[model samples]
Target chain A: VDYPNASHAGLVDTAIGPKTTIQFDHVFIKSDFKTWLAHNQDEAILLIRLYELGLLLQGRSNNTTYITRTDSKQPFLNKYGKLVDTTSVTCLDIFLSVVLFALNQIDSLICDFKNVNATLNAKKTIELITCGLIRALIAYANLVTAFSADKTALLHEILLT
Target chain B: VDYPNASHAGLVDTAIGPKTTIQFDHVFIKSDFKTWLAHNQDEAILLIRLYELGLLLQGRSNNTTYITRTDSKQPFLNKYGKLVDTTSVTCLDIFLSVVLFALNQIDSLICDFKNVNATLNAKKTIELITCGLIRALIAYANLVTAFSADKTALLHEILLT
Candidate 1:
């Protein structure tokens, strides 16, 4: 799969022969999120990521800093997503793609919300997951309700999503 | 955790458990830099909350308040980081580049790439969507096992072809 990207267009992907997991590994471990996981585990992380993602999509958190994830990003790119333009296959189309994707990813995990008995702090863990999902679902309301940014300004400003 | 922040002390954390704060912080950071710099620089202005990253990439519009690059590096951010004397100056440039890259993403889908430039509103609309993508990406950046940019590239690459 990666071969096609690198082979077809070498500009960005051809820099080195093989990409190492070193940076990603170090980033994951050294980051405070790892410590956060020690407290709440993957359930909280996944829900929070989804919830935050919903906020980004809704145009609520307007001037902050945060950047990316790995392959789970596919469902919302140009192919699946539409323009943030007005009179827009658009809001709901893009919004659903993410929810479904998040759900799929979560369901596949070896020890996701459905099956996490080993991790301690189950109490904090469950609340975090619940809140995360609640926030995520509420955020998605931007697609259905009037909950959005003003017309004079564009809602979202960055493009890491 | 959610305990200390909500409980006035412990009640908050205990009641809410730990909430999702990182995503909020990320949204707050990348959320406005695009539009912030737009007001500051290249004559183009721009705009997250991240609930489900793509809301988790839905189309959203809002009243906004935004920037540009190169040539003498005539930088001038002030409020959050660089306007006249703030800290975002350094982070702003990095963000500016990310915004430009994201806007360019819709190049093929947007059709008359050269024509949209005639209207500032179009420019504004495009910027919101761009930030949408950024937050969307970061939402997924929450992913482990791979690099966000790298994997994202594959998604785009496979998608178009």
Candidate 2:
């Protein structure tokens, strides 16, 4: 009936369950994006994916910082060993897999992102997660008091002057 | 077989065929984006959608201006009246609908971008076209001699300053 909440930084390994905590810089800057994405790719990807997971969790609960797998209850986590309230992390094996698979569908120059393929027979979920991803990215690219409301400026001024 | 060429502005109505022409300014600005999108919505959607159509056409040929459907068929245009090769706009009815359907999947702060949905049984084509669309929009917002390769700049400077 209840669930243990782990920090959102927890690793989302599908086979075992979320384990380690990977945090978001949130204020990660431009060069930081290009560099870290070049160095440890998972760091960049996790930001978008975790943000997306938060967006999903936002629709259901007040806090989005922890894994809230049901204890033999609502909205099952198939890979999660959730029978015990002691499980350290939630399972997003399916969620992360679906997200990566969707990212592979696109061809990006900014970062060549994707690939631990998981086949999701569920159609709407794939569409929902993939589309939700783009929105999360747009927000991430334009968050904080400093985010640009207009990208067209990036087009005109940044390119020429 | 020699084909007669038409302007990129040519109409692309699938059923009756491309009769009139619409043009791309290629230099439409930001407020120019927001207000016009508020007015004749197609003005904005056309930029993204039409640019996508050009991208697809880009793969096969140098010119993405006219819709080179078929002479009695190379790639096959089911709705395109391509027998005599006199079709004006080319058929993007399928392309636009799929792109919009994909857009409807995401939530946005920019603009509400979708509807008039068509069910595309062709799965990969839908994913490919939709994914391709995001790239086109990114490029459009960062094109011209002035385009910003750096969106994070848009993220920081454009917001506070």
Candidate number achieving the greatest lDDT relative to the actual structure? 2
TM-score of 2: 0.22
Classified by CAPRI criteria, candidate 1 counts as incorrect
lDDT string, candidate 1, A1-161, tens digits: 65767657665323321121011211211112222223433333344356455555546552223466445544333222122211211232333445435543432441355555545776567656543443343233222111111110111111222
What TM-score, computed on C-alpha atoms, does each candidate reach?
A: 0.19, 0.22
- Candidate 2 local Cα displacement, residue B158, angstroms: 17
lDDT of 2: 0.32
The TM-score between candidate 1 and the true structure equals 0.19
Number of clashes recorded per candidate: 78, 8
Task: List lDDT for all candidates, in order.
Answer: 0.31, 0.32
Query: Largest DockQ belongs to which candidate?
Result: 2
Write model 2 residue lDDT over B12-113, tens digit each, in one string.
Answer: 222221222211122221222222223433334444445344445446223334575545432233222221122211122223333333333333312443
